[PDB]
Assembly symmetry: C5
Homo-oligomer: 311 residues x 5
Amino acid sequence: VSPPPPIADEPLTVNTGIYLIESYSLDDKAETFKVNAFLSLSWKDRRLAFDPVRSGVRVKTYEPEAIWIPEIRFVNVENARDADVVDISVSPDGTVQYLERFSARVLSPLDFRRYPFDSQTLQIYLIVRSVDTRNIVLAVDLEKVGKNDDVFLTGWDIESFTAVVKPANFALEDRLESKLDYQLRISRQYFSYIPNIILPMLFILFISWTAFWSTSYEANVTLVVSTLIAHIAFNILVETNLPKTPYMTYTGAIIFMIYLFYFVAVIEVTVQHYLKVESQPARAASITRASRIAFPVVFLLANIILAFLFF
Amino acid sequence: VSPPPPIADEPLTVNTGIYLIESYSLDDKAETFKVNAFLSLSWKDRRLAFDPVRSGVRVKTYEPEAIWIPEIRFVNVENARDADVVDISVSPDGTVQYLERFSARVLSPLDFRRYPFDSQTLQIYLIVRSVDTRNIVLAVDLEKVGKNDDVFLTGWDIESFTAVVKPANFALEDRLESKLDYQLRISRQYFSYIPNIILPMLFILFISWTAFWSTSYEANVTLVVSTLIAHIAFNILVETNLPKTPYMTYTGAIIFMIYLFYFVAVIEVTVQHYLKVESQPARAASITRASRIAFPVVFLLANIILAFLFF
Amino acid sequence: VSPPPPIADEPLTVNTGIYLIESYSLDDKAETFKVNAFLSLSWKDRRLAFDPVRSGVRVKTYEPEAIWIPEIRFVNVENARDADVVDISVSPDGTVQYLERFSARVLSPLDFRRYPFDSQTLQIYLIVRSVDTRNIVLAVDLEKVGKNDDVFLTGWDIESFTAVVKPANFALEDRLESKLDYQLRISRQYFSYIPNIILPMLFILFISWTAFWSTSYEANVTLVVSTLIAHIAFNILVETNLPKTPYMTYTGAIIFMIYLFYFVAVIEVTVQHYLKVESQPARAASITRASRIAFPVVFLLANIILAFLFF
Amino acid sequence: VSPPPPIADEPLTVNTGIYLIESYSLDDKAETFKVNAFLSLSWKDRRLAFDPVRSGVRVKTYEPEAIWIPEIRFVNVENARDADVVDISVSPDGTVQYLERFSARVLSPLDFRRYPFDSQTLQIYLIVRSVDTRNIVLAVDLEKVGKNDDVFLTGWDIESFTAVVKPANFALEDRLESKLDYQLRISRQYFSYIPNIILPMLFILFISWTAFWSTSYEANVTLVVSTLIAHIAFNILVETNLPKTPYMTYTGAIIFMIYLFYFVAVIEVTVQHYLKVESQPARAASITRASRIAFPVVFLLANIILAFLFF
Amino acid sequence: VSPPPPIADEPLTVNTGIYLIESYSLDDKAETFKVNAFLSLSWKDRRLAFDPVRSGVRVKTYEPEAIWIPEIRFVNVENARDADVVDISVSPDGTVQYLERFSARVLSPLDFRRYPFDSQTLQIYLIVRSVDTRNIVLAVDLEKVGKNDDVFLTGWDIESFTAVVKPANFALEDRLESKLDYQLRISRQYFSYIPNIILPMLFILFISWTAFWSTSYEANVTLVVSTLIAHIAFNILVETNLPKTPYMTYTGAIIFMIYLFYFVAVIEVTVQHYLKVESQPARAASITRASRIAFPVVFLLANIILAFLFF
Ligand SMILES: [Cl-]
Ligand SMILES: [Cl-]
Ligand SMILES: [Cl-]
Ligand SMILES: [Cl-]
Ligand SMILES: [Cl-]
Ligand SMILES: [Cl-]
Ligand SMILES: [Cl-]
Ligand code: NA
Ligand code: NA
Ligand code: NA
Ligand code: NA
Ligand code: NA
Ligand code: NA
């Protein structure tokens, strides 16, 4: 089969739509999600036109093999989509109405700067390559763009599914390509991070500060080093659920800054002991009393400044 | 092939029946499960009718290619089901009796609020898309719905496998769709959680309370901080077998609350030492004696209130 | 093609055989194993009979497409088996001799009660569905049942591969089904559990009992709490190699019981200190002396009783 | 079909070009990467020549089945590439212009010596096997060699995508082979290694050196042994993201050397205590004072020498 | 198609050759490796013979479909190999020269007794099943056995790739089978085990022996118990990279024996304290002084004896 011939010198407009059935597996480390959806295509093929009076039928159904169908592909996919044709219908004027159900693993990068309080715009790019006989341009039929009410992405809130209606038309290996941008806007459910990571991490830090109400070097060393090791365990746990970013994340900044607090608590604990041994308990006392106020105050201001830079 | 033509203006009724052969791999984190079952379909095609006297045969067998078969799909699947046709039989009146054996990865959300004492209703949605010539409606043939007595879901108790007999008929991309709800009711085997997570977690907590019968600051600091770290290990272990929920789970609530007990034990241990050093052992004694009763009592009431809110 | 017609009213007997070449991937968590074997089928089709004098040939080879072949399936498989036909041979009388080499992931439940000293009977169920024209019954040809001398299941001892020669004949969706039970009997190689889990676990427990020869509360608290944490690490390690059972396992019982020993060692360590502080070292001395004998004795009797209940 | 016949004694030149659409999943442990690209092939087949007046078209399209296409393979792939033909265009001279979109898992060794500050040259080898009738030679059409502006390897900086234009022509099993080298030059984003591994590791080491300002053997033993265990956790974490190299890596060398510092800190802590007990606090004092300067100085020079050997 | 008919009563000799292109993913726990090679087959079929004078051609190319090809299989594979035919060439006498490029996951057991200083012989078994008309025997064409110089197995040294030229001819289900043994000889790159596991493990052990230069029970208990827990972490790490063997490995032996050293250090530490408390510091002194020499000496002799038994 050959593509539909033009009346003048106009390109062929293939009207597209995506309707999400199942959205799943957002892998933060891999920066990938899986999709199960309807892909609907529509174009005019004058060669397929018929008279509904003479033919009796108001619509004709065709097997993909019988008629010309445009080679439509996804750009940002891992492998070629698993697709199964559902229906092909032709109207009297020759307007073809194609529908397939597909499944694909989409590769769209994420912005972890505000993590776990981040929002994302997942991208799905549709593309068509022009043939030598005719140039093919993509279009968005908004009535056939959308999603199921049951569509759920675990640990995420699905905000919207829309399309950037104007295609990106460009040359690639001396042939025209028509790209379309479908956008899935989602926002992370930060809830569980609070009782599982944030609050346990602050509790261990506050436990280290009880060393400011103790003269016992041996006990202090145990308090600050034990809690420091539990902080290393949280840092390791957190970095396992994220990829290696060339920038700092919100949780990353807080986790890093808390090391400085532990490091300075060790210097305080050391200085206090050294002085007690040097028979200077009075000077050691002043530094400990100051630390009781200084540590929570510097922690609160530091966190305010960090939240300000990130939000 | 074309669909069966109607006598009047009635829709085509495709009678369905899923019979579970194998139920396996319920991944709590992914909220998916895998199924292996028989799918049976039955409809009338007057075009296939024959006289049993003239043809001799009482039933005719057909290859899927030879006759019209409705395009039946699962809604909440990851990818299209792996299916293999077992038999196609036609009765004199033209009643077709289709049977296939399939396997699919079903995606159905889980409610972790009462975990590990939760029960679920796993959903399996069957669907058919109406053609322009005729509208197709699904039906449940209850004589052909069921499961093998050997069907076993590891770590779960299979309660029932039933179907919501009235289909959800609705429009989707200007065509009628007929959805059916098959339900697999299961309940978690909470047994192993008791000797592996719940009881070890309570033992370490009770070990921390032995600090209320000790005047040794150094030993107390070791007791409470060590057990706190083992509690962090259990929290990390528990959260690895579950997804990130925008709500609190039963085990989650208990695990979180226990941090508050450890935090308050550290303040008690600190206060007791401070007083002993300030030459106030009498006041420190009263607080320690009170803690011996207060801690187990507040723990028991808190747990009663939590069980009440969750069950 | 149609099935072979009967002489009288007798069912068609399909003679079966399985010869294992490769057995691998016994996942204890998934309760699955993978197999690569020969499936041999044999039946009489009188329509295929020939005279060896007239035809010259003593045997005729057919492509699967050319002749009728029974639809044979495995019951307890995850997905349909990957099969490749090796040979199809027809004798003068019409006896067909089919042979294929297949690979499948078998789902057969395991009994972890005596773990890691358990033995299993892995099940492989072969099934055939009767057609409307004729009823098909399965049979075991013992000369074609067996296993390769190289067959090795990692961490397991392969005892036998046999077949329960009498099929389970039953009705399923108003048609006859003939099921056959092939059994692979295996026994776990418990060896490595001794130097890697059992002996390290007993060593840490015996190290905790050295607290019965110490008056140092601070050292005792370190001994019992440190070793308790190493016991938690072994419990976590052990439960990762097993699924969640609704019953107690041998290792499970021992691991759990050992927590009680640690809990009671903490009470002893606490009581001893309390008394020393109360200026009652004599009473504390009696309890410590008793613990030295009591702890290993109660541990030995408890373990004898447990081994008795489980073996 | 047979290959194109020569005019004289010249080999057939198949012009190639790879245009990267997606580059993802660079696994350091496996030394693999995944690619999604355009493969374009072009050759002359005079047997396909046509007159456009006669044909009614200026460019002919063929299905792969219809015409002779050279068997082009990748060398360093795990399995055969997943390819889908996009277009085949024949011009009146007989110039075939083939285009396919493929995806493959490329196996290429990585040099971890300077890790995590390493740069790589990923290799992609194209090959063609000569037939008995004609010898096939590969060529690079530079106008068809490029990469999409969005191509992003997570945790890596993509520097260039080029081709070594001169093929490696050689004998293999008495037939000519024409190999082409496509190179992807990338450089690791070392950023995250600094706040997640390097700085936490140095902080714990500096915490161990606070033992040089303490006379408390019990506290010192806790300081040096605790931090040593946290260093073991970092070493285990680091070696999990890398394969086993028969050479030393930069991070590997630093991680190893730091063990020597911990080992010598333990000897210092031991010597200091032994002397204090032997009533020689003066000698112990000199060694401790020297250690305060010696340890950071020897650490700084050692690191300078290491950076010098590796960069 | 039928197999080539015999002149006498001689079997058909199929000449084989494997040429490795890619050898990768040796997974110790699964005892598997993945291979990507060339499989070349050659046999005489007198029916395909031609006169080069009359036919003009010196060689004829055939599609697999057109001529008889022997069903060649691998024995020790997980699934059937992914193969793609490269070329089929026929010489005047009727000598067929087949060539395919395949990929397979080979299952060959490994001997971990000397681990990580082990060497292996990975075995690849080629097999052919004789038909009723003729018996098929395999042969090795040494000129077509070999490997690419770039072939690299990560963490392993490839020594040789050879074939056991005499096939194992045997009966299996009353038909002859001709097995061939292709051997890939490899030796582990033990290098990284030295700075990552062996040396860190010895350092922690030597740190435990500093307890022999301390009278401080509290410090000793910390030294020996802390280092014991780090030894448990190395044992857990090591056993994760290996399968469960019914025999002892070299690393396994050393790791196990080191537990005995820790156990005896705890008894020494306990005895020393008990004596000091019983006002017997002189007796405690003798035992401690002896332990300083005894422990490293018994460790050195034990290790010599172990290396001797294993190498
Ligand atoms: Cl696609
Ligand atoms: Cl489906
Ligand atoms: Cl099957
Ligand atoms: Cl390829
Ligand atoms: Cl094979
Ligand atoms: Cl034999
Ligand atoms: Cl034979
Ligand atoms: Na088409
Ligand atoms: Na059909
Ligand atoms: Na301590
Ligand atoms: Na057949
Ligand atoms: Na071709
Ligand atoms: Na053939």
